[PDB]
Design an enzyme around this catalytic site. Structure first.
Site, PDB file in Angstrom:
ATOM      1  N   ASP A 180       0.856  -1.222   0.000  1.00 44.40           N
ATOM      2  CA  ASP A 180       0.000   0.000   0.000  1.00 44.40           C
ATOM      3  C   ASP A 180       0.880   1.256   0.000  1.00 44.40           C
ATOM      4  OD1 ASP A 180      -2.508  -1.362   0.073  1.00 44.40           O
ATOM      5  OD2 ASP A 180      -3.268  -0.109   1.697  1.00 44.40           O
ATOM      6  N   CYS A 214      -2.027   0.288 -13.454  1.00 47.12           N
ATOM      7  CA  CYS A 214      -2.181   0.314 -11.960  1.00 47.12           C
ATOM      8  C   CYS A 214      -3.414   1.207 -11.772  1.00 47.12           C
ATOM      9  CB  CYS A 214      -0.865   0.691 -11.278  1.00 47.12           C
ATOM     10  SG  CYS A 214      -0.071   2.154 -11.986  1.00 47.12           S
ATOM     11  N   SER A 215      -3.440   2.111 -10.789  1.00 48.89           N
ATOM     12  CA  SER A 215      -4.567   3.074 -10.671  1.00 48.89           C
ATOM     13  C   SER A 215      -4.424   4.138 -11.765  1.00 48.89           C
ATOM     14  CB  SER A 215      -4.690   3.692  -9.305  1.00 48.89           C
ATOM     15  OG  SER A 215      -6.010   4.182  -9.111  1.00 48.89           O
ATOM     16  N   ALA A 216      -3.281   4.836 -11.809  1.00 47.44           N
ATOM     17  CA  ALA A 216      -3.067   5.954 -12.765  1.00 47.44           C
ATOM     18  C   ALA A 216      -2.466   5.421 -14.080  1.00 47.44           C
ATOM     19  CB  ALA A 216      -2.202   7.019 -12.108  1.00 47.44           C
ATOM     20  N   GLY A 217      -1.833   4.238 -14.024  1.00 48.97           N
ATOM     21  CA  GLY A 217      -1.101   3.646 -15.158  1.00 48.97           C
ATOM     22  C   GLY A 217       0.201   4.375 -15.472  1.00 48.97           C
ATOM     23  N   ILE A 218       0.989   4.779 -14.456  1.00 53.73           N
ATOM     24  CA  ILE A 218       2.271   5.526 -14.699  1.00 53.73           C
ATOM     25  C   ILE A 218       3.351   5.112 -13.689  1.00 53.73           C
ATOM     26  CG2 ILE A 218       1.185   7.453 -15.946  1.00 53.73           C
ATOM     27  CD1 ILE A 218       1.621   9.161 -13.331  1.00 53.73           C
ATOM     28  N   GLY A 219       2.973   4.767 -12.462  1.00 51.96           N
ATOM     29  CA  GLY A 219       3.920   4.498 -11.374  1.00 51.96           C
ATOM     30  C   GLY A 219       4.439   3.088 -11.482  1.00 51.96           C
ATOM     31  N   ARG A 220       3.667   2.129 -10.956  1.00 48.67           N
ATOM     32  CA  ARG A 220       4.026   0.685 -10.932  1.00 48.67           C
ATOM     33  C   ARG A 220       4.122   0.152 -12.366  1.00 48.67           C
ATOM     34  NH1 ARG A 220      -0.443  -1.032  -6.359  1.00 48.67           N
ATOM     35  NH2 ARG A 220       0.244   0.445  -4.772  1.00 48.67           N
ATOM     36  N   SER A 221       3.220   0.605 -13.239  1.00 49.33           N
ATOM     37  CA  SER A 221       3.140   0.265 -14.678  1.00 49.33           C
ATOM     38  C   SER A 221       4.477   0.616 -15.327  1.00 49.33           C
ATOM     39  CB  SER A 221       2.019   1.025 -15.343  1.00 49.33           C
ATOM     40  OG  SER A 221       0.740   0.633 -14.846  1.00 49.33           O
ATOM     41  N   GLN A 261       6.670   7.417 -10.550  1.00 51.96           N
ATOM     42  CA  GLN A 261       6.058   8.564  -9.821  1.00 51.96           C
ATOM     43  C   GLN A 261       6.988   9.057  -8.700  1.00 51.96           C
ATOM     44  OE1 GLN A 261       2.045   6.653  -9.270  1.00 51.96           O
ATOM     45  NE2 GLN A 261       1.320   8.741  -9.604  1.00 51.96           N
TER      46      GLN A 261
END
Ligand code: JG4
Length: 281
Positions: A180, A214-221, A261
């Site tokens: 998280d 992911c949620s935004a599609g930029i960090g983990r993605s 991010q």
């Protein structure tokens, strides 16, 4: 070599500094279609937009907009679609894009609920016998099988075009153990996950581009794509140490804003690539 550059940045604790230079150097391109009033409810975050040049268009005549970007890595011969967690309203659109781009894999790097909020609509069926119909886009989705493991889950899905009765098998790779807050301590289970996706053929040029969110599609993605591409270039090049992860990240950022991010994600990406390089060499 990046391993020695890792120790440098780490021993000097310069991650926030490196990360800030990348922020400065990143491409900025128009995203006029994202900002049209009619598309306001198709975007999860107002500050996360596909650039107009790299955006995926839906083949519906009405409104072709989805929050999604094609990232083309020419030297690595790899493509990815990066998209937001679908919204309640965009689940039909999400599966229409999977259909139209001939993708074989969906890669999900978030849980549906994190930090007590919804990060993502529940966009696949939970039981074999309870299939989903998207009336807006005339598609039917059935869970075929579900293989639950410690760090991730793989689901076989059948996607049916109700218009033409064609069907396709889609693989859903769901990394369920990203914490998280922050990044995993060890990249071991993430690398394992990356190897499993590769092994499925979902990253292969005989299929459309993998969809990654992911949620935004930029960090983990971002970490997913950056690691895959950097490892592939280390196989391809005469000198594997020619590979600069900062250069690769800036080339990916021409296609979608904000990939990676945090300085933590940047560091984790170095560690993923460094560790994955051992298994490859
Ligand atoms: C989170 C951000 S926007 C959103 C939403 N859009 C439509 C319904 N719920 C959920």
């Amino acid at each position: 070599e990046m391993e020695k550059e890792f120790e440098q940045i780490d021993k000097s604790g310069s991650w926030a500094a490196i990360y800030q230079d990348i922020r400065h150097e990143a491409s900025d391109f128009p995203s006029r279609v994202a900002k049209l009033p009619k598309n306001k409810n198709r975007n999860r975050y107002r500050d996360v937009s596909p650039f107009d040049h790299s955006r995926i268009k839906l083949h519906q005549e009405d409104n072709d907009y989805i929050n999604a970007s094609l990232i083309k890595m020419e030297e690595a011969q790899r493509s990815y679609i990066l998209t937001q967690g679908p919204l309640p309203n965009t689940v039909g659109h999400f599966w229409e894009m999977v259909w139209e781009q001939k993708s074989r894999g969906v890669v999900m790097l978030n849980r549906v609920m994190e930090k007590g909020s919804l990060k993502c609509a529940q966009y696949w069926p939970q039981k074999e016998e309870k299939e989903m119909i998207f009336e807006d886009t005339n598609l039917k989705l059935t869970l075929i099988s579900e293989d639950i493991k410690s760090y991730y889950t793989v689901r076989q899905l059948e996607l049916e075009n109700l218009t033409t009765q064609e069907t396709r098998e889609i693989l859903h790779f769901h990394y369920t153990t990203w914490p998280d807050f922050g990044v995993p301590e060890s990249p071991a289970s993430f690398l394992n996950f990356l190897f499993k996706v590769r092994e499925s053929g979902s990253l292969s040029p005989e299929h459309g581009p993998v969809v990654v969110h992911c949620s935004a599609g930029i960090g983990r993605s971002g970490t997913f794509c950056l690691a895959d591409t950097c490892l592939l270039l280390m196989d391809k090049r005469k000198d594997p140490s020619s590979v600069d992860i900062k250069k690769v990240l800036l080339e990916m950022r021409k296609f979608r804003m904000g990939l990676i991010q945090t300085a933590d994600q940047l560091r984790f990406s170095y560690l993923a690539v460094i560790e994955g390089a051992k298994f490859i060499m």
